[PDB]
């Protein structure tokens, strides 16, 4: 029975030994989010915040909640140029913002830099997710800083932090990443939430999100870790949360942004990519890579 | 191809990127065992050692190797009184010692204490494995000390240590446990070995072991952890070993053996068991529990 009203429970959280009807689950989820924000001084009451929005359940849900709590939540979507996948992601995301009258910023990777994640992978030599991850972190930050956002929110959740933690133990982040001179802050307001929890909010709130996952991968290390931890969690609710809980610079020559070297990894990657595009005659020889500067 | 001779490989160890024919796998396993013994000063050349032998693959294999290396390896088996299971375990174990002319010590739990692990569980209030585990640790030690063994060896392996480590991270031991006044030392010479590795040695050496597992459990926490870690290991060989590696008193009033209280957990358990047997008229009222003393 629902713990708040005593009518039919629509969501059960064995992790928390808690059951709620639709309305009170939705109420709890939102309130629990505002709790994380306050417990870690993540945001200011109506603060502008740049939300990294993929079109997936977590980031749409997050965009949804932060609005509800009255923050000025601007979304940033990055069209990564991964085929129909990147196309659908953008569509969904745009559909979402359109319906809610939220403002959406979009960076199209091929229009801005000349190559989509696939060609970027082939040319940089990195695995697609390495190139892609690096490209996502850089551009979100740059967009943030360029547009005056003190802070940036991602929809990373309990499953993510625990999977990451587990990955490190096998192969040797905090709710708030502190603002620095060339770095906006990164808050994860869904850090305590289960994936199943976020998915529940998303379904009960009627949010249409992109069900398709990205073609690669499909061999993700993160996925392997999540299965193994879910296999445990199923039989031992609260395992992930216990696990987690238990445990707890220079300016780039090309672009001005923070790095521990002369040239940042991002500039270093697009530099080489451009160089090799030239050698293979894909770019004119007199073209160079000019990153936007701080 | 086998790394030592170049003929057909019979065992592959992706964990180690190593392949060996039967003869050279057997040679490697034995030599790797003698390595663990020396690297951690576990044993002396012909030292007497009490081997906890269940009749399973690990302890028979271990009993086999320690003999081969010329240690005086006496086995200890505990008939725990768990139905046909405890019966078969004893048979297998006896068959093994008989064929190799090794000496086997046996403690039958019902003959010594009056109850088998099942009744022991019901009467102590503990889950069978809690009563059983406590009973096994106590009796092995007592037998060791009573018989003048400085040291005791168990067949616990990499899978076991990693499963245990994982269990603690979710729900908050060393190769050598140091001899103390009332405690013989405990060496695990198979601590670096995979389960699959030990099983391989066992099969290639032609050792007949007890394939049946114990009726409870069948819900083991240790089992859950091992699956989840194997699920990872399959896709990422060396995960367990990385995981592991990365990370790295008073006398009892009744019985004289070490404890952190007045009466040790073992004496405390059999005491209550006897008391409740009396109340239920299963023991005469004038009978008391007299544990053997140091
Ligand atoms: S999966 Fe790899 S490639 Fe596909 S989006 Fe996430 S990171 Fe970029
Ligand atoms: S499983 Fe539980 S009960 Fe069966 S033997 Fe191992 S410990 Fe004793
Ligand atoms: Zn309710
Ligand atoms: Zn740079
Ligand atoms: Zn060989
Ligand atoms: Zn005692």
UniProtKB/Swiss-Prot annotation, chains A, B:
Changing residue 129 to S: Decrease in Fe content, and about 90% decrease in catalytic activity. Changing residue 214 to S: Decrease in Fe content, and almost complete loss of catalytic activity. One of its GO terms (molecular function) is 4 iron, 4 sulfur cluster binding. Changing residue 57 to A: About 40% decrease in catalytic activity. SUPFAM superfamilies: Adenine nucleotide alpha hydrolases-like (SSF52402). It comes from Thermus thermophilus (strain ATCC BAA-163 / DSM 7039 / HB27). Changing residue 160 to A: Complete loss of catalytic activity. Zn(2+) 2 binds at residues 252, 255, 264, 267. Transmembrane segments: none annotated. Conjugated to TtuB via covalent linkages involving Lys-136, Lys-218 and Lys-221. The thiolation reaction consists of two steps: a first activation step by ATP to form an adenylated intermediate of the target base of tRNA, and a second nucleophilic substitution step of the sulfur (S) atom supplied by thiocarboxylated TtuB for the adenyl group. However, it is not clear if the S-transfer mechanism is direct or indirect. GO terms for biological process: tRNA wobble position uridine thiolation. This is tRNA-5-methyluridine(54) 2-sulfurtransferase. There is a cross-link at residues 136, 218, 221 (Glycyl lysine isopeptide (Lys-Gly) (interchain with G-Cter in TtuB)). Belongs to the TtcA family. TtuA subfamily. ATP binds at residues 52-54, 58, 78, 155, 160. Catalyzes the ATP-dependent 2-thiolation of 5-methyluridine residue at position 54 in the T loop of tRNAs, leading to 5-methyl-2-thiouridine (m(5)s(2)U or s(2)T). This modification allows thermal stabilization of tRNAs in thermophilic microorganisms, and is required for cell growth at high temperatures. TtuA transfers the S atom from the thiocarboxylated C-terminus of TtuB to tRNA. [4Fe-4S] cluster binds at residues 129, 132, 214. Zn(2+) 1 binds at residues 2, 5, 21, 24. Pathway: tRNA modification. Enzymatic activity may be regulated by TtuB conjugation. The gene is ttuA. It holds the Pfam family ATP_bind_3. Homodimer. Is able to form a heterocomplex with TtuB. It catalyses: [TtuB sulfur-carrier protein]-C-terminal-Gly-aminoethanethioate + 5-methyluridine(54) in tRNA + ATP + H2O = [TtuB sulfur-carrier protein]-C-terminal Gly-Gly + 5-methyl-2-thiouridine(54) in tRNA + AMP + diphosphate + H(+).
